[PDB]
Structures are given as structure tokens and as C-alpha cells.
């Protein structure tokens, strides 16, 4: 569910994922259109791929259960659905970690106009 | 619902 990705993002970067990570650039929070703009954003665009890949499950709502095996996400068996959105998340989580070093606030509230273009997954 |  997307609060559970928010509270991963968090254990995970320290970054709440509101508002760090529901308005930022291109794809997250409200991904669509346009060049992603930095490595955090190409993190958003693939986690939208992945989402994309699941079109009849519901990643906003449904419930996954993971556990940590020291500092590991490790994503525990529930419904298909539930395990292949808890792998999308866990993949986005690490990616916004492997690229904190690039964060950049200038991304925050990033304005619709400048996102133009398809991009395909 | 994906991302699209």
C-alpha cells in the first residue's frame, strides 16, 4: 500500500516520503510525462514501469508484509499481487537510497509544464 | 492500477 512504501521510504532514506517524495520531478508522487529529471525521478519513472506491469492489482490499497534481515528488505509470501507490488516498492526504496547523493530540493513541487513527452518502460 |  502506499503507506507502507511511504514508511519503507523512510526507513530506508531518513526522507519522509511525504513531502520528499510525493511531488518530485517528473514521476514522483504524480508520475506521466517527460524526462525523468535526475536519478531519484528515473527511480520514480521504473517504479511506475512496475506498477504498470500489474494491471489488476491495486498497489494504492493492498497490504504486502516484509521483514528486514539486518538492514535487507526481504518481502514475505502473501497474495501474487502482494508480493510482486512489495518488489516494485522494495526496488524504489533502494534506488531512492542508492541515489541520495543526488537529492536535489530544486525537484520538490516540480511544475507539470516542464514534463512533456512520452518515455517508454 | 500501474503506473502510466
Known sequence: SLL??????????????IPSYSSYGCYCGWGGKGTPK??????????????????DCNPKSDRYKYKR?????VCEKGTSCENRICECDKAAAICFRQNLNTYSKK???????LCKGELKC | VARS
Do not use: Q, S
Open chain 1, 107 to 113: 525537484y520538490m513541487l516540480y511544475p507539470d509544464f
Open chain 1, 4 to 17: 507502507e512504501f511511504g514508511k519503507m521510504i523512510l526507513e530506508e532514506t531518513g526522507k519522509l516520503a
Open chain 1, 38 to 55: 535526475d536519478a531519484t525521478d528515473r527511480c520514480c519513472f521504473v517504479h511506475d514501469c512496475c506498477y504498470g506491469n500489474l494491471p
Open chain 1, 69 to 73: 534481515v539486518n538492514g535487507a528488505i
